[PDB]
Tab-separated table of N, CA and C in Angstrom:
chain	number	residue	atom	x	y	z
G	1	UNK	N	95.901	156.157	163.857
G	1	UNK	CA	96.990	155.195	163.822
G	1	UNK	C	96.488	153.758	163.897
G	2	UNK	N	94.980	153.586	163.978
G	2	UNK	CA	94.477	152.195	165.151
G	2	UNK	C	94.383	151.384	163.383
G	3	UNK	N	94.807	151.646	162.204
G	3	UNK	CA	94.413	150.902	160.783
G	3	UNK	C	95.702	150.353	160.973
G	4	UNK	N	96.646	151.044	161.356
G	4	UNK	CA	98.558	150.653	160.828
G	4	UNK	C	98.869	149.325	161.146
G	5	UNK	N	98.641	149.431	162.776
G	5	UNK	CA	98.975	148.288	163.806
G	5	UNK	C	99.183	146.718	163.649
G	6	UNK	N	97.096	146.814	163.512
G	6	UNK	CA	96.777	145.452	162.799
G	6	UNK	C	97.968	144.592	162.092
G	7	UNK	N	98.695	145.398	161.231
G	7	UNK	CA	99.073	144.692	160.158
G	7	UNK	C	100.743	144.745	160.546
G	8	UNK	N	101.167	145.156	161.661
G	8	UNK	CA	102.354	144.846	162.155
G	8	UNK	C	102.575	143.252	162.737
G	9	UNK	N	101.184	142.616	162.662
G	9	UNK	CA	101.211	140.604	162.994
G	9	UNK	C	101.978	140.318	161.929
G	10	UNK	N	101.839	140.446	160.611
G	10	UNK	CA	101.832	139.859	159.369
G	10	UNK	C	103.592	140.514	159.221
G	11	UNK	N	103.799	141.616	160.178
G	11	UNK	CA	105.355	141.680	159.824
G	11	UNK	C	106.117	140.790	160.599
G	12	UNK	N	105.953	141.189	162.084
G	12	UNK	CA	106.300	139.874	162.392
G	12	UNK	C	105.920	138.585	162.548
G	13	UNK	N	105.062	138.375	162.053
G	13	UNK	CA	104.939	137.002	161.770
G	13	UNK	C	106.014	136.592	160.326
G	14	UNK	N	106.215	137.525	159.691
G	14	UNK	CA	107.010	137.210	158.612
G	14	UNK	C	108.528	137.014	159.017
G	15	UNK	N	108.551	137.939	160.647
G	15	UNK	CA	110.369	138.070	161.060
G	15	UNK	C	110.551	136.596	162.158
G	16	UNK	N	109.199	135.769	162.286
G	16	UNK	CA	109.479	134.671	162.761
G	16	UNK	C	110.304	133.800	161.830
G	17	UNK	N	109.835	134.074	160.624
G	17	UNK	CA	109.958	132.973	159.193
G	17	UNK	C	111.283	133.273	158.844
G	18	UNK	N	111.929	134.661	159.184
G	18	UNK	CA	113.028	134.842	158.642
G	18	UNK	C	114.599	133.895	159.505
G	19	UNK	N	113.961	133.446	161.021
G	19	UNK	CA	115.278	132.509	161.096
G	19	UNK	C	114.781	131.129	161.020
G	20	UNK	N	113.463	130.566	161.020
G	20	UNK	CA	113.272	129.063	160.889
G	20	UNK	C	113.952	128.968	159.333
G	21	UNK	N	113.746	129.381	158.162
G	21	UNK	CA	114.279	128.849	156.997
G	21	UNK	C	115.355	129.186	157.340
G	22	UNK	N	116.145	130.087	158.103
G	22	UNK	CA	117.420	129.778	158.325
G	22	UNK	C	118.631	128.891	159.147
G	23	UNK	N	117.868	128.570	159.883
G	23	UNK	CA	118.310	127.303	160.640
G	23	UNK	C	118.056	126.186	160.159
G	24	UNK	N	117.435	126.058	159.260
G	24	UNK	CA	117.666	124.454	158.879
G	24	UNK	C	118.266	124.946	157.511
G	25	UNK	N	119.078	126.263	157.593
G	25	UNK	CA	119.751	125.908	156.181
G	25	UNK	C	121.413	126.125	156.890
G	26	UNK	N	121.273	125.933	158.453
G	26	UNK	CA	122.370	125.599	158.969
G	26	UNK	C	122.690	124.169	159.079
G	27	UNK	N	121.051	123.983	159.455
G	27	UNK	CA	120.984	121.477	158.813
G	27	UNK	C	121.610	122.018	157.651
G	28	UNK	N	121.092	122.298	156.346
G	28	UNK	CA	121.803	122.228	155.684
G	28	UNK	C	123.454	122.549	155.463
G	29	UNK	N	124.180	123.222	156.150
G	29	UNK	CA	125.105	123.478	156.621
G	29	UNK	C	125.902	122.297	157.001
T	1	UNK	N	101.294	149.791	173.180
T	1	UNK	CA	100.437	150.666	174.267
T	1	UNK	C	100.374	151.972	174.220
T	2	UNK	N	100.455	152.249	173.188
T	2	UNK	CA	100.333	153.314	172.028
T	2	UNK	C	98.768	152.979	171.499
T	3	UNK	N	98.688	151.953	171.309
T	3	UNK	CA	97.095	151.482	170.848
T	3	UNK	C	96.085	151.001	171.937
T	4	UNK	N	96.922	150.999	172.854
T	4	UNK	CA	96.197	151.296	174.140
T	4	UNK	C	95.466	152.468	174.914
T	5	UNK	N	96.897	153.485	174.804
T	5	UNK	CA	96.443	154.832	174.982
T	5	UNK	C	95.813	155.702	174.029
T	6	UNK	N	95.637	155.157	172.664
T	6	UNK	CA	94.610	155.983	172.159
T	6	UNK	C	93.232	155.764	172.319
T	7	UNK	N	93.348	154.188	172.318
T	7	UNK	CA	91.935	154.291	172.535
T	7	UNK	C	91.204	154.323	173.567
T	8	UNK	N	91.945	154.278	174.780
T	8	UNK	CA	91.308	154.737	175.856
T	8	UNK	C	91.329	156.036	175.963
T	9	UNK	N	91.963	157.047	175.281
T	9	UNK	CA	91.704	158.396	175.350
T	9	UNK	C	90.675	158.560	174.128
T	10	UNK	N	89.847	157.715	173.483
T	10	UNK	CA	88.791	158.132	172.953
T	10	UNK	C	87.596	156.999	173.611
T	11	UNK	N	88.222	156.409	174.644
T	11	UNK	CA	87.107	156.475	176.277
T	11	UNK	C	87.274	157.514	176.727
T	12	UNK	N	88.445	158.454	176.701
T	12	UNK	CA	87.995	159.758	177.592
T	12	UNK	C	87.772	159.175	179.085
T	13	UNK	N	89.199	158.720	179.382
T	13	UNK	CA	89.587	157.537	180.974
T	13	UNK	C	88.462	158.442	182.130
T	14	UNK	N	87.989	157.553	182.785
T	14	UNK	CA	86.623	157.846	183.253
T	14	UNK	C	86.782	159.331	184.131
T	15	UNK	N	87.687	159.505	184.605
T	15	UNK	CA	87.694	160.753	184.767
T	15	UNK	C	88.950	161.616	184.671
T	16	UNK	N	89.761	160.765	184.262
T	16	UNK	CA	91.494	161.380	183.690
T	16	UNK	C	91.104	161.195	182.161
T	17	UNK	N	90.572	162.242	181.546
T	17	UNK	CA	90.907	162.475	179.931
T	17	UNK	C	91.690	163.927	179.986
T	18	UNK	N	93.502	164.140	179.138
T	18	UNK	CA	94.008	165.495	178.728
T	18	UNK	C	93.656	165.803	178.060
T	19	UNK	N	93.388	167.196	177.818
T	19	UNK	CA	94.062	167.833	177.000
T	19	UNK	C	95.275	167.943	176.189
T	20	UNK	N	96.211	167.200	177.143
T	20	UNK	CA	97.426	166.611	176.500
T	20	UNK	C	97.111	165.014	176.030
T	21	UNK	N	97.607	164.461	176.532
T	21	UNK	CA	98.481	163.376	175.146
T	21	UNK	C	99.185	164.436	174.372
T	22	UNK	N	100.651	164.562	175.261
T	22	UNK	CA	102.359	164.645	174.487
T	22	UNK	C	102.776	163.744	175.009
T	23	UNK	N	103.307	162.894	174.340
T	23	UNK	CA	103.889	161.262	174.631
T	23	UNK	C	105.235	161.538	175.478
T	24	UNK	N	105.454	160.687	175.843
T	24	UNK	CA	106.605	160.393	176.502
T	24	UNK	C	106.891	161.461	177.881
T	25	UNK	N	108.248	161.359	178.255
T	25	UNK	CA	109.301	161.753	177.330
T	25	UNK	C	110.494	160.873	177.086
T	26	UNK	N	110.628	159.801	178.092
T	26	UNK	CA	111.002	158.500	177.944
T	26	UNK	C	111.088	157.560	177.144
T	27	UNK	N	109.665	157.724	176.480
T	27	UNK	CA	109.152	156.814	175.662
T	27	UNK	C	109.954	157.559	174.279
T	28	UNK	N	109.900	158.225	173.982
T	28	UNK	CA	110.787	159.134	172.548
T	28	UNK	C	111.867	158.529	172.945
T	29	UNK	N	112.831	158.759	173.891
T	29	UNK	CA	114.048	158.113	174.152
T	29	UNK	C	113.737	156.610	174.029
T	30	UNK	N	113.076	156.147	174.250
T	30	UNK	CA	112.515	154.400	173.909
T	30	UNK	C	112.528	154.143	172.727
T	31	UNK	N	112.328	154.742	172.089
T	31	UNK	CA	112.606	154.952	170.421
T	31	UNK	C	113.927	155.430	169.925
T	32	UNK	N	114.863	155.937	170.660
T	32	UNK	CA	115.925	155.825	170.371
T	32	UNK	C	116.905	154.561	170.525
T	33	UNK	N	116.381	153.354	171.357
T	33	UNK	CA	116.840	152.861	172.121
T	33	UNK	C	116.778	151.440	170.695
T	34	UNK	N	115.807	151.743	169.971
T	34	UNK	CA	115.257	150.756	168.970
T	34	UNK	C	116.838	150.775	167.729
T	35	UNK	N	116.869	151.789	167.697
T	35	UNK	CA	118.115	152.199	166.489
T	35	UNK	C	119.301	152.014	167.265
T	36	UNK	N	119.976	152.272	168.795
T	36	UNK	CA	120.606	151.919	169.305
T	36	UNK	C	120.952	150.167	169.241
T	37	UNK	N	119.906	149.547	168.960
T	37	UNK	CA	119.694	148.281	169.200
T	37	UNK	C	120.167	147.948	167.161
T	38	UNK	N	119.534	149.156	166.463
T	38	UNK	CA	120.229	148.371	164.755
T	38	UNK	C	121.523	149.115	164.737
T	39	UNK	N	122.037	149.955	165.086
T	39	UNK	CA	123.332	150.528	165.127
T	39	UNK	C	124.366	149.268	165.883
T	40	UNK	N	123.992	149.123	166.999
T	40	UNK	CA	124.786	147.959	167.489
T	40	UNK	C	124.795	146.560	166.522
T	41	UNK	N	123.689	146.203	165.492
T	41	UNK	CA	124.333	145.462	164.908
T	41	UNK	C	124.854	145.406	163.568
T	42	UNK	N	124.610	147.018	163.128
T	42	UNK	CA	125.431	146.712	161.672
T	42	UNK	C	126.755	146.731	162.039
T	43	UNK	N	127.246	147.240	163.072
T	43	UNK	CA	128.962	147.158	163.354
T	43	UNK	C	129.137	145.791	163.647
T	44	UNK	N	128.806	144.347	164.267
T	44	UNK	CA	128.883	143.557	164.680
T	44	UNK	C	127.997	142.370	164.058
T	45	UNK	N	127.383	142.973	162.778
T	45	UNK	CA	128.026	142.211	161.706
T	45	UNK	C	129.005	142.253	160.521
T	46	UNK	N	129.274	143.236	161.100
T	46	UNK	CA	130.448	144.232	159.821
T	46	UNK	C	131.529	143.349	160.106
T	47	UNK	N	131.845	142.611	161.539
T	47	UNK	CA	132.792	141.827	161.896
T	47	UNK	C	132.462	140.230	161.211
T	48	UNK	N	131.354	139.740	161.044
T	48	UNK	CA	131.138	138.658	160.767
T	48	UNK	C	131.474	138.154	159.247
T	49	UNK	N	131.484	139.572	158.753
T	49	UNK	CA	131.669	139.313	157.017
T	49	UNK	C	133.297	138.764	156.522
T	50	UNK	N	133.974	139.327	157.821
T	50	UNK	CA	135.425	139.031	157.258
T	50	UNK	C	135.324	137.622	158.578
């Protein structure tokens, strides 16, 4: 299982990204 | 801690290594607790759409 893990950063690091572009498309709002 | 406990069970914990490793049994229910957590919000955004 110790290959999978690693690469669970890069998911969430991607589910950080998913509310910053969304809050400033509440600025935009 | 799943990637914790494996790899200290391939330290073979200095003098606690099982034969088992069967996970949980808590922890399986801990994993239920994950879908409990997306179940609670497709209904409560099901409210947000209207």
């Amino acid at each position: 299982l110790s290959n999978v893990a690693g690469v669970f950063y890069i998911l969430v690091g991607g589910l950080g990204l998913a509310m910053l572009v969304a809050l400033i498309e509440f600025c935009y709002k | 801690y799943t990637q914790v406990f494996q790899v200290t069970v391939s330290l073979g914990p200095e003098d606690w290594r099982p034969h088992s490793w069967d996970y949980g049994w808590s922890f399986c229910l801990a994993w239920g607790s994950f879908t409990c957590c997306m179940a609670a919000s497709v209904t409560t955004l099901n409210s947000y759409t209207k």
